[PDB]
Amino acid sequence: ADFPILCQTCLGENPYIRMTKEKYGKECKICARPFTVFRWCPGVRMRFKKTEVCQTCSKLKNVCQTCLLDLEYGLPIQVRDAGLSFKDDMPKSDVNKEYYTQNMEREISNSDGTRPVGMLGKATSTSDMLLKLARTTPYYKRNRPHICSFWVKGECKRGEECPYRHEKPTDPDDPLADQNIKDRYYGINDPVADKLLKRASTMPRLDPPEDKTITTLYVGGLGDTITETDLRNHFYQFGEIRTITVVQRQQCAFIQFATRQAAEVAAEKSFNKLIVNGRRLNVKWGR
Amino acid sequence: WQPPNVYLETSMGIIVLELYWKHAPKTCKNFAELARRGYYNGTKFHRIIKDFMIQGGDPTGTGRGGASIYGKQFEDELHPDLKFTGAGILAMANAGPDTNGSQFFVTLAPTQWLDGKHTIFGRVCQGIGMVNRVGMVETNSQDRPVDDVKIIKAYPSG
Amino acid sequence: DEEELNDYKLRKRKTFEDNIRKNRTVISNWIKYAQWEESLKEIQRARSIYERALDVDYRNITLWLKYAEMEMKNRQVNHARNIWDRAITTLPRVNQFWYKYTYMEEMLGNVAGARQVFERWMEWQPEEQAWHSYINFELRYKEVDRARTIYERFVLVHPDVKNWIKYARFEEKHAYFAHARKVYERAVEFFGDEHMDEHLYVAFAKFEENQKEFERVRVIYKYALDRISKQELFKNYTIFEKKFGDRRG
Amino acid sequence: KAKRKAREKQLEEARRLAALQKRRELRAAGIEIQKKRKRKRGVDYNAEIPFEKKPALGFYDTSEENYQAL
Amino acid sequence: QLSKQYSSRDLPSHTKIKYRQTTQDAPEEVRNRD
Amino acid sequence: TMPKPQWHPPWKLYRVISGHLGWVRCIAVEPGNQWFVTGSADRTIKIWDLASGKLKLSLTGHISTVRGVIVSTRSPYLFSCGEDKQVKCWDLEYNKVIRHYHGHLSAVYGLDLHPTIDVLVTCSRDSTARIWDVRTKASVHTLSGHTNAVATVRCQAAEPQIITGSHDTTIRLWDLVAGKTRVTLTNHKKSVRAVVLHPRHYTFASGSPDNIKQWKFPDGSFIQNLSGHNAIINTLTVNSDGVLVSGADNGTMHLWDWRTGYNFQRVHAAVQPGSLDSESGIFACAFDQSESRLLTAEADKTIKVYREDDTATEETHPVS
Amino acid sequence: EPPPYGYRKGWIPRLLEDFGDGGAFPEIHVAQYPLDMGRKKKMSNALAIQVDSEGKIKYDAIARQGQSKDKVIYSKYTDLVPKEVMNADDPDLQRPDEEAIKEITEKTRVALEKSVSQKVAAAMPVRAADKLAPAQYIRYTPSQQGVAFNSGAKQRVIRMVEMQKDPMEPPRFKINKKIPRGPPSPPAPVMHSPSRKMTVKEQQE
Amino acid sequence: AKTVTKQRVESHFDLELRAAVMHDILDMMPEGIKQNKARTILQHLSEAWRCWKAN
C-alpha cells in the first residue's frame, strides 16, 4: 500500500498524523489473505486504530478500510448500496469466495488506483436520500475506548489509566450492539442499517394527491424576494409549467403544470430543499 | 454567409448542425466559416459527459486550445427563449463570458443549467442516434474518451 | 417443494460438480449439468456453466451451439446475438455458426443485419454453397440488383465457367437477357484462349437458340471452336450432337 | 467392481430415504435438530453459482431482458 | 506469499560463472575464424 | 509468381556414423567446430570429432531419453535436458555435472540458451516453459499459458525474445522481462514441433504436418506458406545462404529456399542394415558452423552427414 | 415542415416529426426531442458499438474485449493473405541494430537480476535481517475536502514507521490453500484454412 | 514435483512411452475424424508388447 483508506472520523484531527507500518501484518477478514497494516494514533488519549481490510477488499465496495462506512456518504453499506439501488453479486462460500477474491485481485491489478471497480461508478448517482442520511460532523466518539470490565465490576485499580471508558455498559438487548464485522461488510442484516432504513423512511418527503387533474402545486413559505420568473426557473425546464400564482397575501405559490411527472420531479425533489435565495418553500399539490 | 446545415462527418458517423443566425448570427458565422475552413480536421472530442454533453472542436485536444474567426474569441450571442433543454444543443461553451473560441459542445439531454452561460445556437439536424452512441462510449477520468474520435470531413452546407 | 425437492437439487448438483471435477475435460458432463439446469429453469446458473465450459475448451462447436440454443429457446435475443458474433469471431471457418446466425436473424426480420453479416461472412470468401444460400436469401426478396451484385462478387472471387453460367441462368429466368449477353461476353473474354473450353460456349449457343438467331449461332459456334483450343474427342461427338441441334432447331 | 457399485447405487438412496423419512417426521414433530455442520464445498451448489463467470455482453440490449419461472 | 521452507540443494553453490577464456574459444575468435 | 529462386547446389550423403543404442534425438555443434554432440534415447551423451567422426567421449548421467542438448557460447558448459524431468549443466573441464535445475513436472522436451545474458529456457510436457538463471539454479519466470505439451522453444536477443510452439497447435511469442505472452498465432492446424529463426533477416519459420509457414518479427505477421512436405515435421534448420532444411518423421528430408519458398531437393535415405522401414525418421538436424556440412540424427540410431556437391551447375540441375 | 426562422413562434413541437429532417428550437421553451434526443434512457449492457475510421463495423472490439491496446489480435483476412517480399534489402527484412540490442540487454539483465535476488533470498530463509530503513514522510491529499474534518486543513503530512518483526517468530499464516485455476485469457481467434470433410471412403480407410 | 528414482523407473518409462504414442500419431496422423480411438490404439500397443515378449 501507499496509505490507508478511511473517513475523516476514523482518519483524525491533528494536522500531523502518526501511523506505523508493518508489511504483511495480518489477514483481511474479506480477502482472507495477508495485508499491510498501518496503525494510526487517532486522538489525544483516543484508541490507536489500524487498517482492517485489504486495499482490494476496499476498492471492491468503496468503503472505509477502518471506519467501514462508505467514503462518499458514510452510511451502512447496505444503505448506500440500496440508495444507489445497487445489487452486488459477491460470492460467499469458502472455495467460491477464494476463487472470487483471486480473480478479483487479478482484475483490479489492471486498475490505476483512482476509483473503485465496476458498478461503483455506474451507480454514482448519489441520491438526495443518501445525501440527507449522510452525517454532517465528525462523530469522533469512535476513538473512545471500550468498557473497562474491571471498571464495570469495580476492579480497574490502575487509577485513571483504565484502558477503557469506565462508564455504564450498554444493555446488549439493543440491536445496535452485536453486528458481526463480516456481516456488516457483506451487508448482511445490519440492525444499524435497518435503523437507517426506518429513519430515511420516516424522514419527511413530499406527499402525492389523489386525482390526476390536481395539477396545481402549492409552495408554502415564499417571501417577497421571489419573482414569478424565479419560481419558473425553479420549475420551468423540469417539464413545462401551465401557470403560477405567487400569493403575496399569504407568501406562497402555485404551479399548474403541463406534465404531471414533471410536476412530480420538480416538487418532490424540491421538498423543503428547493433553496433559491435561501427561503424554505414547501412543495405540495394544491387544492 | 450562413451555412444552413454544416456537415461534420465524424469518424463513427456523420453530424450536421443547423444554426439559427436570427438567434445566433455571430457564432453562426463563426461555425459556418470555420467548418468551411476545415481547420477542424483532427479534433478529438475534448469532453464526454455521458448522456449530458458531447464537446469537441479544439486544434489542441486538451481543453486549453482553440481560436475563432475574430482573433482568439468573441462575445456570446445570447437568446431569450433558446435553451439547452434537450439533446443536440450546439453552443460553444465559455470558461468566462465573451471568450468563446473554437471548441464546440453538443448536448445529449436537458442541460438547462448552462443556459445563460452558453448561447444556444442551433441543433444537430443529422446524426442524433450517432450522438447517443458517442455519448455512450467509455471515457477516461478526463473526458477525453478512451476512443480517439475525430471528424472525417468538416464543411458547410453549400 | 420446500426441502425434499431442494435436497434432490443439492444432490444432483454436487454430483455434476464432482464429475466435472474429476475430468473437466470431455464435455458431456458439462452439457448434462447445464441442460439439467435449463430444465430446472435457472438460466443464470446455466449461463455461468457454459462460460466455464467454454473457457476449458473454446474450440468446441457443440458447446458454442447448445449455448446459443439455450439463449434462443429462451429469447434473450440480444444475448443470443452477442453469443453468435463472439462465436463467428473466434471460430470463423466454421460455417454452421454463420448459418444459424442468419436463420435466427431472418425469423427475427432484421434483414439489414442479415445482409451485413453476410458481408462479414463473404470477407472470408467462404464457399460456393454459402454464396448460393446468400443469393436464395436475397431472392426471397426482389433485390435483383443485390443478387447480381453478389453474382458479380462470387464469380469474380471464384473463376468458374459454371459460375458464369449460373449468373446468366438467373439473368434468363428473372428475364434480363441483355445482361445475359454481357455476361457471356465477359465470361468468354476472361476465360478466353487457353483453358476456356466447350461448355460455356454450348450454353451461349443455346441461349441464342432461344433467340432463334441461327446465323449468329453458327458463327459463334464455329468461331469459338476455331479461335480457342479446338477438339476432346467425346466432347467433339457432343459438339456433333449439339451441331445437329443448332442446325435443325 | 462394476456390479457391486450398482448395488449401492440404490441402497445409498435408502439411506437418504431413511434420513428423509425420519427427519421430515422428526423435525416436523417439534424438534429442528441439525446433524451438524462441517461441509467445505457442499453448500457451494444450493447457495451460489459455484465458480461464476458472468456472460460477456456485446453490442446489444441485455439489461431489461429477463426470464420467467418454473 | 513466499514460504520460509527451504532445501539442502538450494544452498548457495557454484556462485561464479566460468567465462570462456581467450585460449579456449572466446566469442571473439569465433567472430574472426575462417 | 515470384522472382526466380537462386540456384543452390545439391547435397549428397557422405558419412554415416553408428554407435548409439537407441534413437538419436538431438545434435549440436561446438562453437569452434572441432566436435559435435549427440544425445540419444539410450540415455548417453556422446561427443564426436567432426573431421573424422571418431567418438571422443560418452557421458552417462541421465535416467532416461536425453531429449535435447546445447552448448554455451560464453562459458565452457553443455546443457542437457531429458525425459526424467531433469535439466543438467555439464562442465566440460572436468567432464562432470555441476548444476541441476529442478522444478519441471514432466519430461523436458527441449531447451535453449540466451546468447547475451546467462539464462536458460526449457519447455516441457506440463505445458509450461521456464526461465532459469544459469548461475543460481532458480526459476525467474514460468511462462505459462499453452494448453498442452510445449514441443519447442527458441530464444533470441531481439524482440520478442522467446518463441514457443506447442501441441495445442498454437505459437506464442513471449516478453521475457515481463514474462508473459505478447502474440498468439493460431494459423497451424496440427501440432507445431519445429520453429527456426533466420540468422540475418528478422524472420522465423514454423513447421507442422500441414505446411511450413514463414513469419515476420516482431508482431508475427504472415509472410508465406511453404508446402509439399506432408509428413510429421520434426526439424527445421536454416543456413546462412537461404537454404532451409526440413527433416520429417517418416524419414524424408526436403531442402528449400528460405526466400521464395521453393523446394529444390528431396532426400530419402536408406535405413542402416538391420532396421525396419518404419524405423526411418529424423529427429535432429544441424548445420555446422562453416555451414558447409549438414548432420542429421535419425530414428534408426544413425548420424547421417551430408556435404555440398561441388560439381553441379544450373545446367546440370535446372531450376523450376 | 418546421416553421421558418423568424416564423417559428407560437408552436411547441412535441412529436419528433415537427423536426422535419431534425432540429431543436432553442427559442421554443420546451425540451426538444428530435430523433430520440433529450431522453436519458435505460442503462443497458451493450458496450460501445464503435465504427472504424472508414465507417465499418469494427468487431476488433468484440475480439479485444476487456483487453488493453497492447494485445495484437489477428482476426482480419488481410492477415491471412500472403504478403509478398522479394527484397533481401528492404527495411522490413532488417533486425534492430546492436545499439538497441545492448540497451535491451542492460535493461533485461537489471530487472532480471533484481527479481532473481529476491527469489534467491527466499532460499536464505534465515534472513540475516537488515535493520529498518529510514522513516517515511508522505504528504496525503484527501479527496474528502471540508472545513470540519482534519479540523479545517486541506492536507496531512504523515510519518510512516516500520514496526519491528520479532526474530523468534514462527510463520503466521496457513499458506497452503488449494483452489482450481483461474479462468484463462480471452480466447484467440482460430485463423484456419478452409477445412475439408473427408469422403466416407477415406473415412473407412 | 518429485524426482524419478529407482522404483519409478519402469512406471515412468511407460508414462512417457504411452504419452509419446498419444502425441505421435493418434493425434498427429489421424483423419479418423470422429474420436480417434486412441484408447484402442493404445490397447494394440500393449498387446503387441505382450506378443513380442511371448514370441
PDB file of N, CA, C and O in Angstrom, chain F residues 264-312:
ATOM      1  N   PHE F 264      13.803 -27.367 -53.556  1.00  0.00           N
ATOM      2  CA  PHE F 264      14.617 -27.779 -54.678  1.00  0.00           C
ATOM      3  C   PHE F 264      15.170 -29.184 -54.555  1.00  0.00           C
ATOM      4  O   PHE F 264      15.508 -29.776 -55.581  1.00  0.00           O
ATOM      5  N   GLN F 265      15.255 -29.754 -53.354  1.00  0.00           N
ATOM      6  CA  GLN F 265      15.783 -31.116 -53.303  1.00  0.00           C
ATOM      7  C   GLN F 265      14.935 -31.949 -52.365  1.00  0.00           C
ATOM      8  O   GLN F 265      14.322 -31.419 -51.446  1.00  0.00           O
ATOM      9  N   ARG F 266      14.909 -33.260 -52.595  1.00  0.00           N
ATOM     10  CA  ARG F 266      14.217 -34.190 -51.713  1.00  0.00           C
ATOM     11  C   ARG F 266      15.074 -35.422 -51.489  1.00  0.00           C
ATOM     12  O   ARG F 266      15.327 -36.178 -52.428  1.00  0.00           O
ATOM     13  N   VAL F 267      15.504 -35.633 -50.252  1.00  0.00           N
ATOM     14  CA  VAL F 267      16.365 -36.744 -49.884  1.00  0.00           C
ATOM     15  C   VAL F 267      15.548 -37.776 -49.134  1.00  0.00           C
ATOM     16  O   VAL F 267      14.726 -37.445 -48.275  1.00  0.00           O
ATOM     17  N   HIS F 268      15.775 -39.038 -49.451  1.00  0.00           N
ATOM     18  CA  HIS F 268      15.124 -40.155 -48.780  1.00  0.00           C
ATOM     19  C   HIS F 268      16.253 -41.145 -48.565  1.00  0.00           C
ATOM     20  O   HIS F 268      16.587 -41.903 -49.473  1.00  0.00           O
ATOM     21  N   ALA F 269      16.851 -41.130 -47.387  1.00  0.00           N
ATOM     22  CA  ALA F 269      17.962 -42.029 -47.156  1.00  0.00           C
ATOM     23  C   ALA F 269      17.442 -43.437 -46.901  1.00  0.00           C
ATOM     24  O   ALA F 269      16.241 -43.688 -46.859  1.00  0.00           O
ATOM     25  N   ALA F 270      18.355 -44.375 -46.743  1.00  0.00           N
ATOM     26  CA  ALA F 270      18.008 -45.763 -46.506  1.00  0.00           C
ATOM     27  C   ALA F 270      18.445 -46.126 -45.106  1.00  0.00           C
ATOM     28  O   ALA F 270      19.492 -45.669 -44.640  1.00  0.00           O
ATOM     29  N   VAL F 271      17.658 -46.959 -44.448  1.00  0.00           N
ATOM     30  CA  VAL F 271      17.953 -47.272 -43.081  1.00  0.00           C
ATOM     31  C   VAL F 271      19.145 -48.214 -42.986  1.00  0.00           C
ATOM     32  O   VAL F 271      19.339 -49.108 -43.803  1.00  0.00           O
ATOM     33  N   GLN F 272      19.947 -47.993 -41.956  1.00  0.00           N
ATOM     34  CA  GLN F 272      21.002 -48.880 -41.524  1.00  0.00           C
ATOM     35  C   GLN F 272      20.574 -50.333 -41.635  1.00  0.00           C
ATOM     36  O   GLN F 272      19.414 -50.647 -41.412  1.00  0.00           O
ATOM     37  N   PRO F 273      21.504 -51.241 -41.955  1.00  0.00           N
ATOM     38  CA  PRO F 273      21.136 -52.601 -42.348  1.00  0.00           C
ATOM     39  C   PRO F 273      19.999 -53.270 -41.607  1.00  0.00           C
ATOM     40  O   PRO F 273      19.023 -53.662 -42.241  1.00  0.00           O
ATOM     41  N   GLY F 274      20.075 -53.405 -40.307  1.00  0.00           N
ATOM     42  CA  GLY F 274      19.067 -54.244 -39.712  1.00  0.00           C
ATOM     43  C   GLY F 274      17.799 -53.579 -39.259  1.00  0.00           C
ATOM     44  O   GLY F 274      17.152 -54.078 -38.342  1.00  0.00           O
ATOM     45  N   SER F 275      17.390 -52.493 -39.877  1.00  0.00           N
ATOM     46  CA  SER F 275      16.271 -51.715 -39.389  1.00  0.00           C
ATOM     47  C   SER F 275      15.038 -52.039 -40.194  1.00  0.00           C
ATOM     48  O   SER F 275      15.130 -52.424 -41.352  1.00  0.00           O
ATOM     49  N   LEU F 276      13.880 -51.880 -39.576  1.00  0.00           N
ATOM     50  CA  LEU F 276      12.636 -51.938 -40.320  1.00  0.00           C
ATOM     51  C   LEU F 276      12.547 -50.695 -41.175  1.00  0.00           C
ATOM     52  O   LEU F 276      13.326 -49.764 -41.013  1.00  0.00           O
ATOM     53  N   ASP F 277      11.620 -50.688 -42.119  1.00  0.00           N
ATOM     54  CA  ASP F 277      11.479 -49.458 -42.871  1.00  0.00           C
ATOM     55  C   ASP F 277      10.669 -48.424 -42.120  1.00  0.00           C
ATOM     56  O   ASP F 277      10.745 -47.245 -42.457  1.00  0.00           O
ATOM     57  N   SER F 278       9.885 -48.839 -41.133  1.00  0.00           N
ATOM     58  CA  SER F 278       9.179 -47.915 -40.268  1.00  0.00           C
ATOM     59  C   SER F 278      10.060 -47.378 -39.170  1.00  0.00           C
ATOM     60  O   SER F 278       9.561 -46.700 -38.282  1.00  0.00           O
ATOM     61  N   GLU F 279      11.343 -47.660 -39.213  1.00  0.00           N
ATOM     62  CA  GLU F 279      12.319 -47.084 -38.310  1.00  0.00           C
ATOM     63  C   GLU F 279      13.215 -46.173 -39.113  1.00  0.00           C
ATOM     64  O   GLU F 279      14.424 -46.181 -38.976  1.00  0.00           O
ATOM     65  N   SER F 280      12.609 -45.440 -40.018  1.00  0.00           N
ATOM     66  CA  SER F 280      13.236 -44.321 -40.679  1.00  0.00           C
ATOM     67  C   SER F 280      12.557 -43.083 -40.156  1.00  0.00           C
ATOM     68  O   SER F 280      11.333 -43.011 -40.153  1.00  0.00           O
ATOM     69  N   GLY F 281      13.333 -42.133 -39.691  1.00  0.00           N
ATOM     70  CA  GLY F 281      12.742 -40.919 -39.216  1.00  0.00           C
ATOM     71  C   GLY F 281      13.826 -40.046 -38.674  1.00  0.00           C
ATOM     72  O   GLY F 281      14.806 -40.555 -38.150  1.00  0.00           O
ATOM     73  N   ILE F 282      13.673 -38.742 -38.792  1.00  0.00           N
ATOM     74  CA  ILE F 282      14.726 -37.800 -38.485  1.00  0.00           C
ATOM     75  C   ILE F 282      14.278 -36.998 -37.288  1.00  0.00           C
ATOM     76  O   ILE F 282      13.178 -36.451 -37.284  1.00  0.00           O
ATOM     77  N   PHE F 283      15.112 -36.938 -36.267  1.00  0.00           N
ATOM     78  CA  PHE F 283      14.784 -36.195 -35.074  1.00  0.00           C
ATOM     79  C   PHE F 283      15.569 -34.917 -34.941  1.00  0.00           C
ATOM     80  O   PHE F 283      15.084 -33.985 -34.329  1.00  0.00           O
ATOM     81  N   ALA F 284      16.787 -34.854 -35.461  1.00  0.00           N
ATOM     82  CA  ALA F 284      17.529 -33.613 -35.319  1.00  0.00           C
ATOM     83  C   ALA F 284      18.318 -33.322 -36.570  1.00  0.00           C
ATOM     84  O   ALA F 284      18.805 -34.221 -37.234  1.00  0.00           O
ATOM     85  N   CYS F 285      18.438 -32.045 -36.884  1.00  0.00           N
ATOM     86  CA  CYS F 285      19.271 -31.577 -37.974  1.00  0.00           C
ATOM     87  C   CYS F 285      20.157 -30.462 -37.452  1.00  0.00           C
ATOM     88  O   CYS F 285      19.783 -29.728 -36.544  1.00  0.00           O
ATOM     89  N   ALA F 286      21.328 -30.315 -38.042  1.00  0.00           N
ATOM     90  CA  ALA F 286      22.179 -29.210 -37.638  1.00  0.00           C
ATOM     91  C   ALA F 286      23.174 -28.841 -38.723  1.00  0.00           C
ATOM     92  O   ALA F 286      23.854 -29.707 -39.273  1.00  0.00           O
ATOM     93  N   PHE F 287      23.260 -27.563 -39.053  1.00  0.00           N
ATOM     94  CA  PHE F 287      24.329 -27.113 -39.920  1.00  0.00           C
ATOM     95  C   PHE F 287      25.580 -26.883 -39.095  1.00  0.00           C
ATOM     96  O   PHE F 287      25.525 -26.397 -37.971  1.00  0.00           O
ATOM     97  N   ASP F 288      26.723 -27.213 -39.665  1.00  0.00           N
ATOM     98  CA  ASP F 288      27.958 -26.980 -38.939  1.00  0.00           C
ATOM     99  C   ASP F 288      28.203 -25.469 -38.926  1.00  0.00           C
ATOM    100  O   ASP F 288      27.388 -24.696 -39.431  1.00  0.00           O
ATOM    101  N   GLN F 289      29.295 -24.996 -38.320  1.00  0.00           N
ATOM    102  CA  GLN F 289      29.453 -23.549 -38.235  1.00  0.00           C
ATOM    103  C   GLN F 289      30.009 -22.956 -39.523  1.00  0.00           C
ATOM    104  O   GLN F 289      29.698 -21.808 -39.852  1.00  0.00           O
ATOM    105  N   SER F 290      30.809 -23.710 -40.272  1.00  0.00           N
ATOM    106  CA  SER F 290      31.120 -23.305 -41.635  1.00  0.00           C
ATOM    107  C   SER F 290      29.896 -23.365 -42.528  1.00  0.00           C
ATOM    108  O   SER F 290      29.952 -22.913 -43.670  1.00  0.00           O
ATOM    109  N   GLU F 291      28.798 -23.919 -42.036  1.00  0.00           N
ATOM    110  CA  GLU F 291      27.572 -24.078 -42.801  1.00  0.00           C
ATOM    111  C   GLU F 291      27.816 -24.812 -44.111  1.00  0.00           C
ATOM    112  O   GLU F 291      27.062 -24.670 -45.071  1.00  0.00           O
ATOM    113  N   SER F 292      28.860 -25.632 -44.126  1.00  0.00           N
ATOM    114  CA  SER F 292      29.223 -26.498 -45.238  1.00  0.00           C
ATOM    115  C   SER F 292      28.682 -27.913 -45.091  1.00  0.00           C
ATOM    116  O   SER F 292      28.254 -28.505 -46.084  1.00  0.00           O
ATOM    117  N   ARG F 293      28.720 -28.477 -43.877  1.00  0.00           N
ATOM    118  CA  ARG F 293      28.226 -29.817 -43.585  1.00  0.00           C
ATOM    119  C   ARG F 293      26.870 -29.740 -42.916  1.00  0.00           C
ATOM    120  O   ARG F 293      26.575 -28.798 -42.176  1.00  0.00           O
ATOM    121  N   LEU F 294      26.072 -30.787 -43.119  1.00  0.00           N
ATOM    122  CA  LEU F 294      24.754 -30.906 -42.506  1.00  0.00           C
ATOM    123  C   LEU F 294      24.641 -32.264 -41.841  1.00  0.00           C
ATOM    124  O   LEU F 294      24.658 -33.284 -42.528  1.00  0.00           O
ATOM    125  N   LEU F 295      24.517 -32.279 -40.519  1.00  0.00           N
ATOM    126  CA  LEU F 295      24.409 -33.513 -39.756  1.00  0.00           C
ATOM    127  C   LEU F 295      22.950 -33.781 -39.455  1.00  0.00           C
ATOM    128  O   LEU F 295      22.187 -32.848 -39.227  1.00  0.00           O
ATOM    129  N   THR F 296      22.565 -35.049 -39.437  1.00  0.00           N
ATOM    130  CA  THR F 296      21.220 -35.420 -39.043  1.00  0.00           C
ATOM    131  C   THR F 296      21.240 -36.619 -38.127  1.00  0.00           C
ATOM    132  O   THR F 296      22.044 -37.526 -38.294  1.00  0.00           O
ATOM    133  N   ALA F 297      20.296 -36.630 -37.206  1.00  0.00           N
ATOM    134  CA  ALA F 297      20.184 -37.606 -36.142  1.00  0.00           C
ATOM    135  C   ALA F 297      18.867 -38.331 -36.311  1.00  0.00           C
ATOM    136  O   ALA F 297      17.809 -37.698 -36.248  1.00  0.00           O
ATOM    137  N   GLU F 298      18.940 -39.651 -36.452  1.00  0.00           N
ATOM    138  CA  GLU F 298      17.910 -40.445 -37.084  1.00  0.00           C
ATOM    139  C   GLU F 298      17.268 -41.434 -36.135  1.00  0.00           C
ATOM    140  O   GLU F 298      17.824 -41.802 -35.116  1.00  0.00           O
ATOM    141  N   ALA F 299      16.096 -41.909 -36.511  1.00  0.00           N
ATOM    142  CA  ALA F 299      15.351 -42.841 -35.694  1.00  0.00           C
ATOM    143  C   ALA F 299      15.806 -44.250 -35.873  1.00  0.00           C
ATOM    144  O   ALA F 299      15.184 -45.154 -35.330  1.00  0.00           O
ATOM    145  N   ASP F 300      16.821 -44.469 -36.684  1.00  0.00           N
ATOM    146  CA  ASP F 300      17.426 -45.778 -36.804  1.00  0.00           C
ATOM    147  C   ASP F 300      18.814 -45.782 -36.224  1.00  0.00           C
ATOM    148  O   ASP F 300      19.659 -46.527 -36.682  1.00  0.00           O
ATOM    149  N   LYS F 301      19.075 -44.917 -35.262  1.00  0.00           N
ATOM    150  CA  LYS F 301      20.287 -44.906 -34.476  1.00  0.00           C
ATOM    151  C   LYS F 301      21.513 -44.484 -35.253  1.00  0.00           C
ATOM    152  O   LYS F 301      22.619 -44.817 -34.853  1.00  0.00           O
ATOM    153  N   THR F 302      21.352 -43.740 -36.335  1.00  0.00           N
ATOM    154  CA  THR F 302      22.462 -43.279 -37.149  1.00  0.00           C
ATOM    155  C   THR F 302      22.568 -41.770 -37.153  1.00  0.00           C
ATOM    156  O   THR F 302      21.600 -41.046 -36.906  1.00  0.00           O
ATOM    157  N   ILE F 303      23.775 -41.309 -37.448  1.00  0.00           N
ATOM    158  CA  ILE F 303      24.063 -39.917 -37.732  1.00  0.00           C
ATOM    159  C   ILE F 303      24.483 -39.832 -39.179  1.00  0.00           C
ATOM    160  O   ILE F 303      25.572 -40.278 -39.530  1.00  0.00           O
ATOM    161  N   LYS F 304      23.651 -39.251 -40.015  1.00  0.00           N
ATOM    162  CA  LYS F 304      23.943 -39.173 -41.433  1.00  0.00           C
ATOM    163  C   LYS F 304      24.485 -37.794 -41.722  1.00  0.00           C
ATOM    164  O   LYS F 304      23.852 -36.804 -41.370  1.00  0.00           O
ATOM    165  N   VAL F 305      25.654 -37.722 -42.337  1.00  0.00           N
ATOM    166  CA  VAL F 305      26.307 -36.459 -42.634  1.00  0.00           C
ATOM    167  C   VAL F 305      26.303 -36.232 -44.129  1.00  0.00           C
ATOM    168  O   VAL F 305      26.888 -37.022 -44.879  1.00  0.00           O
ATOM    169  N   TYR F 306      25.697 -35.126 -44.551  1.00  0.00           N
ATOM    170  CA  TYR F 306      25.607 -34.692 -45.939  1.00  0.00           C
ATOM    171  C   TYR F 306      26.538 -33.526 -46.213  1.00  0.00           C
ATOM    172  O   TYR F 306      26.702 -32.619 -45.389  1.00  0.00           O
ATOM    173  N   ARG F 307      27.120 -33.537 -47.404  1.00  0.00           N
ATOM    174  CA  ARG F 307      28.017 -32.478 -47.822  1.00  0.00           C
ATOM    175  C   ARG F 307      27.487 -31.826 -49.084  1.00  0.00           C
ATOM    176  O   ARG F 307      26.586 -32.342 -49.751  1.00  0.00           O
ATOM    177  N   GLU F 308      28.080 -30.686 -49.408  1.00  0.00           N
ATOM    178  CA  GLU F 308      27.703 -29.881 -50.560  1.00  0.00           C
ATOM    179  C   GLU F 308      28.339 -30.463 -51.810  1.00  0.00           C
ATOM    180  O   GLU F 308      29.501 -30.871 -51.791  1.00  0.00           O
ATOM    181  N   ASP F 309      27.579 -30.502 -52.897  1.00  0.00           N
ATOM    182  CA  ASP F 309      28.076 -31.092 -54.128  1.00  0.00           C
ATOM    183  C   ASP F 309      28.818 -30.034 -54.937  1.00  0.00           C
ATOM    184  O   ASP F 309      28.258 -28.982 -55.271  1.00  0.00           O
ATOM    185  N   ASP F 310      30.074 -30.317 -55.258  1.00  0.00           N
ATOM    186  CA  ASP F 310      30.963 -29.318 -55.832  1.00  0.00           C
ATOM    187  C   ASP F 310      30.968 -29.321 -57.352  1.00  0.00           C
ATOM    188  O   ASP F 310      31.474 -28.372 -57.960  1.00  0.00           O
ATOM    189  N   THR F 311      30.425 -30.363 -57.978  1.00  0.00           N
ATOM    190  CA  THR F 311      30.461 -30.497 -59.425  1.00  0.00           C
ATOM    191  C   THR F 311      29.084 -30.465 -60.057  1.00  0.00           C
ATOM    192  O   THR F 311      28.777 -31.310 -60.901  1.00  0.00           O
ATOM    193  N   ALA F 312      28.240 -29.533 -59.656  1.00  0.00           N
ATOM    194  CA  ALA F 312      26.962 -29.338 -60.309  1.00  0.00           C
ATOM    195  C   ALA F 312      26.762 -27.862 -60.598  1.00  0.00           C
ATOM    196  O   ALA F 312      27.297 -26.996 -59.902  1.00  0.00           O
TER     197      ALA F 312
END
